[PDB]
Each structure stands twice: as structure tokens, then as C-alpha cells.
Amino acid sequence: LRQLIAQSWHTDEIRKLRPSPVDEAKWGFAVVENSLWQGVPNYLRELNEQLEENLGYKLPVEFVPVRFTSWMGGDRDGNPNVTADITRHVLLLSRWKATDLFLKDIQVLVSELSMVEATPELLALVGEEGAAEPYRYLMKNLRSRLMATQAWLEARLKGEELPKPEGLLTQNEELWEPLYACYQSLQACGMGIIANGDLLDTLRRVKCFGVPLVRIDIRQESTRHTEALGELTRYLGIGDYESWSEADKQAFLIRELNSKRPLLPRNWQPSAETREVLDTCQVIAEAPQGSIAAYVISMAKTPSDVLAVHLLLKEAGIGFAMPVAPLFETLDDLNNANDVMTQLLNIDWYRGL
Amino acid sequence: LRQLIAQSWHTDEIRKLRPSPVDEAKWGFAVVENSLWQGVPNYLRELNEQLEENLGYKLPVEFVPVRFTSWMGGDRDGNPNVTADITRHVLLLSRWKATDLFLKDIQVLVSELSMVEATPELLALVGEEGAAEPYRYLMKNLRSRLMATQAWLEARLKGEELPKPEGLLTQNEELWEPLYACYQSLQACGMGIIANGDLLDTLRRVKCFGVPLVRIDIRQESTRHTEALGELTRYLGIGDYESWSEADKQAFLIRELNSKRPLLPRNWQPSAETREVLDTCQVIAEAPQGSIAAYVISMAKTPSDVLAVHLLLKEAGIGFAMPVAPLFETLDDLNNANDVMTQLLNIDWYRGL
Amino acid sequence: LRQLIAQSWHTDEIRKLRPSPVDEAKWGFAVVENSLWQGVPNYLRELNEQLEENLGYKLPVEFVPVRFTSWMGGDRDGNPNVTADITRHVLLLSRWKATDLFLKDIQVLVSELSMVEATPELLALVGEEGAAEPYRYLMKNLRSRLMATQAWLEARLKGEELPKPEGLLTQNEELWE
């Protein structure tokens, strides 16, 4: 205790310079490893004991109701320093860190799963080679696969581009799958107590944190999307989006949202600001699905504000449906909020997207 | 002589299978190294001796009127096997081979240019470090630079992608420049006879063959460009280009040629054929300027045939003006040829391009 | 001719410092590649034509009566500068150079020996894999083996110690065979 207190009196650190989005993103990893990593599964164990005791049933293993997300390196609202480059970086770092923590979990499992009794199905999944140490086989495979993607990300973090390894991890299913295979045979074969221990903790961290460790949220003001699209439209000679009435903008946006011909000029020369808007949707599009939780529009005032980001994301080439969220943060915006959403819900195109 | 004849009687080789564009491209490199390499400069020496003797003047060193080009791996007219991939490859191989032959030239120069007397200008160009062996300095630099790009291309040829070296050679000026520097000081400093020997031979091979060794020509039928563009237009819901009258197609082509908004769908799914047409313009665009001599349109029948390839090249993102050539190869096309070109020359847009 | 003479008038080199045993050893490699390399075999061809013409028989292929040796980097008599280190080096360099010249010979052979007819014994020696291009097989093998030892010696010359490759060449029998 004395040692620890002396530490803090003498271990003085004072930032001399403004922290950076990466620094802030790093503090969030500190919170994840020093507390959330143990905390979520314990929360899930207690919660589960209580359901059975009081209600008579336990949630199924596949149901993990908690998820942690971060805005660190995702929120650019009013922050010049959070550029598309930094987001790209932070996106990368999270994956590096999930590999770090996932490795510790798997080491433990590689040594503790010395069981040799497996189900037809599980033996099938390995069949020979590792059929004399089945659960250890699957954990050994994943360790390598994790070690591979780890190695890849430290290169990328360094600025080195190099083809990605055979077993690069991008999705939680790639982690979940094998882990769940062990659980099932362990349960099936009478090793329930081993299944429900460290593996269960890892199964739940997979869905709670997974591959990205902590999904990020992107957030930019509505105003900046308008400027990007105005600049685009004047360059194309189509007109000036930031002057059109709101009925016109929706018209323009629904037209283009349904259009099969592209709009974003192949090799263009926009202003810094606009490029940032364009680059960030490119990072979104580029990132593995499930890395980004949502696109938040601070200062959302009209139906065109939401349709705008959908247009940009489409131009950035995005394969999945990205949840966009208006952020009403004024008395009148709050007051108009329900009107803004019923109009949005009335557009059939929006409704189905 | 007996040895050599026996060789051919017994050294029997018979292709068992159809040669490939690369094979044919290789035979062309054999012709270049076994005969053109010595032949062009000798031709240029004789030609120059004759001008001075009979007319009283010699052409200037910078004027090399001969250039060799190949269609091998460039001509796809009627040849399925000459795909955009093969062209990309052959394009690469030529550069590998020019590095091979250029290295032999430079070795000779690195050892023979032991002169130490240089001009202010030439010493300036090195200044210290290699200022005690100036011409040897510049040749030593180029040797490395050639050896660097050589190394790079053998990787690419192998299918390995890796950032390109500091001094990668892409243009003839990169070779010409230093070589010409030596010539000037050698002349200036009284070493005329050394200048006009092996260096002069290398100077002329630079412009005659240069970096690409032998520029290629691309050639596809007009008919295939029509199909690519028809397919595109029906996908976009604009109509069907291969049904429109010729006045309409020109209208469509001049419209799009002036358009700042792109046309080629970001991530599209065309037919094999169309993709080949699209991929090849991508190779053209991707290749260093001066690798491709011209785009030949076999079966050119109307003004829209030429405007078509310009449209496609624009969609493929091309920074320079690529010479397109109609190939009239029928009695009626021949007969209509002058009509076809006066209409083309009457379009102001075409005239200025 | 004019070019060549001008070369020598203007290509002036004058050692400023005493040459070293390696330099002298290098001049000897220049003599070997610019003249002995072609010279010995021509001498052996002429000599052989003459035996058959005048005496009626030719020496057997295995009999090569000439051998060249050097004292460069071997003679320390009165020469401090020719230390055990230099000899070690020169010993190494010679092997590097024999690999250089032997490679040129083998390239030629790898391309010119396109024959497919071989003896039981020769096919046996390859048996399958390269049994559809037999002489080319054996030359291809040796090229690699030479390229391997070449690579090894340039490392050693550089001062790098690293285990020696599978097919390192050390004896003439390895080439002869």
C-alpha cells in the first residue's frame, strides 16, 4: 500500500501537449482490459444464476445482450484532428488489441482442454491428425489464425502494405464457430463444468467485444454533408444543392439513390473539408462489416439530412445497410423531430432500406 | 560449321501446342537483341556519315528518326487468347528485357568512362563524392537504378505486389538525361571520339527502344466496342446504343465525352467480352505513358467508331491523348474513308483532342 | 580502331598505391578468362587432330595434360602483405570466379542439349521427371548447384558465415561426372 501510494506521488506524468484521438482511443482499451474483460462475463454469470433461481430458466449460450462501442476516433463533430486517416488507424489498432486479449484467452484454453472424448460431429470437424487431442486441436488452429492476423495488423499499423494471410480474422463468426464446437461436445460428453467455465467466458467476450474489440461510431455534422454535396453538384454543373428548397433536395437525393450510374467523379479535386467527408465514407466502406456501429448526424434538421449520408455512403460503395441516426439537439429540432421522421417513413424507398 | 549444322539436324524442337502471345512476344525480343540492337545505331552512323559527305552536315545527336513497335500481345483482333492480363504481362516483360539489354550497355560505360576532366556543369551535377570519377559516377548511379527496376519487375512478373523502389525507371528521359550529360562534357572537354562511340550507340538506343524496349499497339474490332457500350447503356436504363442511328450515337458520345460525371458503374457485372474491352482500356490507362503507341480500330466504318474508343479510354481514366486509328479494310470502307474523316474533322471537339 | 586507340590515350589509370595480392590475383583471372579459357581447349583440339593425322590415334577424352597454377596470393616469400587471411580470401575468390566462368559454359549447354535419345545408363541416371529432356536435365541440375555455391562464396567473400548449401561444389569430380 505504501509502495503504491509512493508510486503516485513520485510517478508524475502531465501531458505537455493535447492528447490525440489515438491516445483517447488507447485509454478506452485500458478500460476494456482492466475491467470490462472480466466484468461482462461475471455480469452474465450472475444474471444467469438469478434467472434460474427466481424464474426457473437460463438464457441460451448464444444470447449475449451486452455490446461495447466507442466514439473515440469515430467522432469528428467539431474535431478537425479526427481525420479519415486517424479513424482508419484506430480501426486497425482495435483489431490489433482484440488479438492481444484473445490470445491470452486461447493460451489458457490450449493448455486446459486436454479432454479426448468428443462427439461424432466434433471428431468429424478435425478427423485424424488432431483426433487424439481434439479440443486442443481446434484451439491450436485458432491461436495460429489469431497470431497470423496479429502479425498482419502490426505491419499495417507500421505503414507497410502486404497481402493478407490465409487465415486473417475479420468476423466474430470466425472466432465463435470453433469455440462453440468445443462447448457442444464438452456438454454432450459430460464435461459441462469445463464447458461453462473459461470457454463460456470467451464465448461471451466474442459476441460482446469480438474481432473489432469495440465497434466505433462515426459522427459528423449535417452541415458538412450539405457542403460536400453542394460542391459536388456545382462541379458537375447540375446546380447548387445548398440553395435548393428541401423538396428539391429530397427529389435530387431520391433520384440519385435509385441511380445505377455513379456520381462521384473518378479523379476529382475538392476542398480539404469535402475530401475529408468523402474519405471517411471510404474508410467506412473499406472496413470489415461490423467494425462500425452507426453513422450519427449531429445537427439533423430535415429529412434531407438523413438521405444525404445515405447518398454519400452509396457513392463510397457500401455493401451493407448502415444505420444512420439523426441527432436532434435543439428545442426546435426536438420539437420537429417527429415531423422529420414521419416524412422519412412516408418515403417508400427509405422505409425498405 | 559442321558443329553448327549438326546442331540443327539433331537439335529438333517442334511446338506440340499453340504458342501463346507471350511466346510470340518473346520471339520479338530475340529479333531485337540479335539484330536491331546493333543494326539501328549502325544504320544511324552510316546515314550520318553520308549526310556530311554528300550534303555537308550531320543530324544533331538528339534526333533519332527510327522507332520499333510491336503488335505482339497488343493485337486482340480475332484473338481470344490476347486478354488484358496477357497484355499487362507482356508490357511488364518488355521493361524487364530493356533493363537486361540496358545493363549490358551501362556495364561497358561504367568501366570505359575513366575520364576525370569534366565541365563546370557536369561537375556541378555530381559535386563532390563522385567528383574524382565523374562520368563513372553517373553511370554507376544509372546501373543501380536499372538494377532496382529490374528487381522490381521480376517480382511483378512473378505475381508479387510490393511497393516500387526509389529510382524506378518509367520514362526514356530518366535514361537519356544522364547519358546526354556525359556526351556533352566529353565533347566539351576534347573527348569527342569517346563520346561518339559506345555512348552515342546507347543514346540512340534510348530513343529508338527505350524503357519499354518496344512500344506495343492495341487493336480490337469496332464491333466489340459497340457491344461494350450497348451493354453499358442498357444497364444504365439510358437506351440501347447498338440500335441508335449514327447521328444519335455521335450525340451520345459527344455528350458523354464532355461530361464531368462518370458513366462506368463503380462495381458492375458485365459479360466476359465487355469486361475484356473494359479491362484492356484499364491496362492502357495503368501503363506508363509511352508504352503504348496507338489504339487501332480494325473494321472502322463510321465516325462513331473512333469516338467510341475515346469515350471508353476516358472512362478508363487516361491522362494523355492516345492516338486512335480507324482501320478501313474493305472496298466500301476504303471508299467511305474520306467521308468518315471529314465528318470527324468537322466536329470541333474531335479536332482539338 | 580509332575509337580503341582514343580509349587508351584518354582512359588513363595509374595506381597511386601499391597493388595488393588480391589485385595481382585478379589480373591472373583476367589472363584466364581472356585467353586461357579459349586457348587450352583449342590447343587440345589441334594437338589431337595432329596425333590422329600423323600417328593414327587420338588421346582419350579423360586425358587433359595441361593444368594452370598461380603463386598470386600463395607466395609469401619476403612478402609481409601475403598473410594467411589474404590467401584464405584469394582461395575463395578463385572458386567464385570458376563459378562465374562455369556458369557461362553451362548456360550454352542447357539450351543446346535438346537431344532426347539417351542410353539405358543415362536415362537410369535421371529416370522419370527429366526423362523427356535428359541431357538438359543434368545440365539444369549442375546450373543450380553452381548457382548455389556461387551464392555461398559471395557471402563468405563478404565476411558472412552461414551453413553451406546442399549441393556445394568442392571437387572437380562433382563437375566432371
Coordinates of C-alpha atoms in Angstrom, one line a residue, chain A residues 140-312:
Chain A
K140 CA -4.3 -24.6 -31.6
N141 CA -5.7 -23.7 -35.0
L142 CA -7.3 -20.5 -33.8
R143 CA -4.1 -19.5 -31.9
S144 CA -2.3 -19.6 -35.2
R145 CA -5.0 -17.8 -37.1
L146 CA -5.0 -15.1 -34.4
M147 CA -1.2 -14.9 -34.5
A148 CA -1.4 -14.6 -38.2
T149 CA -3.8 -11.6 -38.2
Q150 CA -1.9 -10.1 -35.3
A151 CA 1.3 -10.1 -37.4
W152 CA -0.6 -8.6 -40.3
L153 CA -2.0 -5.7 -38.3
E154 CA 1.3 -4.7 -36.8
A155 CA 2.6 -4.4 -40.3
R156 CA -0.4 -2.3 -41.5
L157 CA -0.1 -0.2 -38.3
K158 CA 3.6 0.4 -39.3
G159 CA 2.5 1.7 -42.8
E160 CA 3.6 -1.5 -44.6
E161 CA 1.2 -2.9 -47.2
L162 CA 1.5 -6.7 -47.7
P163 CA -1.0 -9.3 -48.9
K164 CA -3.1 -10.6 -46.0
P165 CA -2.6 -14.1 -44.6
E166 CA -4.6 -17.2 -45.4
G167 CA -6.5 -17.2 -42.1
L168 CA -7.0 -13.5 -41.5
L169 CA -9.7 -12.8 -38.9
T170 CA -12.4 -10.3 -39.9
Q171 CA -15.6 -11.5 -38.4
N172 CA -16.8 -12.7 -35.0
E173 CA -18.2 -15.9 -36.6
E174 CA -14.6 -16.9 -37.4
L175 CA -13.9 -16.9 -33.6
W176 CA -17.3 -18.1 -32.4
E177 CA -17.5 -21.1 -34.6
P178 CA -14.7 -23.3 -33.2
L179 CA -15.2 -22.1 -29.7
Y180 CA -18.9 -23.1 -29.9
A181 CA -17.9 -26.5 -31.3
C182 CA -15.9 -27.3 -28.2
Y183 CA -18.7 -26.2 -25.9
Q184 CA -21.2 -28.5 -27.6
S185 CA -19.1 -31.7 -27.4
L186 CA -17.9 -30.8 -23.8
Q187 CA -21.6 -30.6 -22.8
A188 CA -22.6 -33.6 -24.9
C189 CA -19.7 -35.7 -23.5
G190 CA -20.3 -35.0 -19.8
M191 CA -17.8 -32.1 -19.3
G192 CA -20.4 -29.5 -18.6
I193 CA -18.5 -27.8 -15.7
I194 CA -15.4 -27.4 -18.0
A195 CA -17.6 -26.0 -20.8
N196 CA -19.3 -23.5 -18.6
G197 CA -16.0 -22.1 -17.2
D198 CA -13.3 -20.3 -19.1
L199 CA -14.8 -21.2 -22.6
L200 CA -18.2 -19.7 -21.7
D201 CA -16.3 -16.6 -20.6
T202 CA -14.5 -16.5 -24.0
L203 CA -17.7 -17.3 -26.0
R204 CA -19.4 -14.3 -24.4
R205 CA -16.5 -12.0 -24.9
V206 CA -16.6 -12.9 -28.6
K207 CA -20.1 -11.5 -29.1
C208 CA -19.6 -8.7 -26.5
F209 CA -16.3 -7.4 -27.9
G210 CA -15.2 -9.7 -30.8
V211 CA -12.9 -9.0 -33.7
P212 CA -13.0 -5.2 -33.6
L213 CA -12.8 -5.3 -29.8
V214 CA -15.1 -2.2 -29.6
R215 CA -17.1 -1.2 -32.6
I216 CA -16.8 2.6 -33.3
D217 CA -19.5 5.1 -34.3
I218 CA -18.8 7.8 -36.9
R219 CA -20.3 11.2 -36.3
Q220 CA -20.2 14.4 -38.4
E221 CA -22.4 17.5 -38.6
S222 CA -25.2 17.6 -41.1
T223 CA -23.9 20.9 -42.3
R224 CA -20.7 19.3 -43.5
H225 CA -22.6 16.8 -45.6
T226 CA -24.5 19.6 -47.3
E227 CA -21.3 21.4 -48.2
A228 CA -19.8 18.2 -49.6
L229 CA -22.8 17.6 -51.8
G230 CA -23.2 21.3 -52.8
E231 CA -19.5 21.4 -54.0
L232 CA -20.1 18.1 -55.9
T233 CA -23.2 19.3 -57.7
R234 CA -21.7 22.7 -58.7
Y235 CA -18.7 20.8 -60.1
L236 CA -21.0 18.6 -62.2
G237 CA -23.0 21.6 -63.5
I238 CA -26.2 20.1 -62.1
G239 CA -26.9 23.1 -59.8
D240 CA -26.1 24.0 -56.2
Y241 CA -27.7 21.6 -53.7
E242 CA -27.2 24.0 -50.8
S243 CA -29.7 26.5 -52.2
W244 CA -32.4 24.2 -53.3
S245 CA -35.5 24.0 -51.2
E246 CA -35.9 20.9 -49.1
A247 CA -38.4 19.4 -51.6
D248 CA -35.8 19.7 -54.3
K249 CA -33.0 18.1 -52.3
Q250 CA -35.2 15.1 -51.5
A251 CA -36.0 14.9 -55.2
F252 CA -32.4 15.0 -56.0
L253 CA -31.4 12.5 -53.3
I254 CA -34.1 10.0 -54.2
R255 CA -33.2 10.3 -57.8
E256 CA -29.5 9.6 -57.2
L257 CA -30.1 7.0 -54.5
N258 CA -32.0 4.9 -57.2
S259 CA -29.5 5.7 -59.9
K260 CA -27.3 2.9 -61.3
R261 CA -24.9 5.4 -62.9
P262 CA -22.2 6.8 -60.5
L263 CA -21.9 10.4 -59.4
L264 CA -18.6 10.9 -57.7
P265 CA -16.0 12.0 -60.3
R266 CA -13.3 9.4 -60.9
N267 CA -10.4 11.7 -60.2
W268 CA -11.6 14.9 -58.5
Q269 CA -10.1 17.9 -56.7
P270 CA -12.4 19.0 -53.9
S271 CA -11.6 21.2 -51.0
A272 CA -10.0 19.8 -47.8
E273 CA -13.3 19.6 -45.9
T274 CA -15.2 17.9 -48.7
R275 CA -12.4 15.4 -49.2
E276 CA -12.5 14.6 -45.5
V277 CA -16.2 13.9 -45.8
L278 CA -15.6 11.7 -48.9
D279 CA -12.5 9.9 -47.4
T280 CA -14.3 9.0 -44.2
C281 CA -17.2 7.3 -46.0
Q282 CA -14.4 5.4 -47.9
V283 CA -13.0 4.2 -44.6
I284 CA -16.5 3.1 -43.5
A285 CA -16.9 1.2 -46.8
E286 CA -13.4 -0.2 -46.7
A287 CA -13.7 -1.6 -43.1
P288 CA -14.9 -5.1 -42.5
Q289 CA -18.7 -5.3 -41.8
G290 CA -19.3 -5.0 -38.1
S291 CA -16.5 -2.6 -37.2
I292 CA -18.7 0.5 -37.3
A293 CA -21.9 0.6 -35.3
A294 CA -23.6 3.6 -36.8
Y295 CA -23.4 6.9 -38.6
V296 CA -24.7 9.7 -36.3
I297 CA -25.7 13.0 -37.8
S298 CA -25.2 15.8 -35.2
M299 CA -27.5 18.8 -36.0
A300 CA -30.0 16.8 -38.1
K301 CA -32.8 19.2 -39.0
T302 CA -34.7 17.8 -42.0
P303 CA -35.4 14.6 -43.9
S304 CA -32.8 15.5 -46.5
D305 CA -30.1 15.4 -43.7
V306 CA -30.5 11.7 -43.3
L307 CA -31.0 10.9 -47.0
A308 CA -27.7 12.9 -47.7
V309 CA -25.5 10.4 -45.8
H310 CA -27.2 7.5 -47.4
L311 CA -26.3 9.1 -50.8
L312 CA -22.6 9.6 -49.8

